[PDB]
Amino acid sequence: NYCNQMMKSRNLTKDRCKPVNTFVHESLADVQAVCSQKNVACKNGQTNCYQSYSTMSITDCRETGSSKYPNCAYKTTQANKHIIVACEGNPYVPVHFDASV
């Protein structure tokens, strides 16, 4: 399972099981470019979030119900959707994944 492997490799579930996570299959520069696109509000209310003009290839990783450390289990869902990231810093780059419309 792609999710069970990438979450492990990326050290996301080596010392615990993370409920959800999304992996973007686009170039890093292309994703970093989102910090200058459509500005929108973040889930929390703050407004340093941005939505992509286009849809991007992504894989959603969702833990199953029976999952428990040390045996985390994930449901893999591939899709193409707009991403919403919160930016910060200089250069202005993404630091959090807010959602995917």
Partner 1 sequence: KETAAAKFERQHMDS
Annotated binding site for substrate: 18-22, 43, 62
26 near partner 1, judged by CB under 8 A: yes
Which one from 96, 97, 99, 100 is the annotated catalytic residue? 96
Options 40-48, 63-71, 72-80, 81-89: segment touching partner 1 (CB under 8 A): 81-89
63 near partner 1, judged by CB under 8 A: no
Among 10, 14, 38, 43, binds partner 1 (CB under 8 A): 10
Tokens of 69: 């450390």
Catalytic annotation present for 25: no
Residue 71 CA to residue 22 CA, distance in Å, equals 20
Tokens of 56: 């991007």
Tokens of 76: 């893999």
Distances (CA, A) of 52 to 11, 19, 73, 82: 27, 25, 30, 5
81 near partner 1, judged by CB under 8 A: no
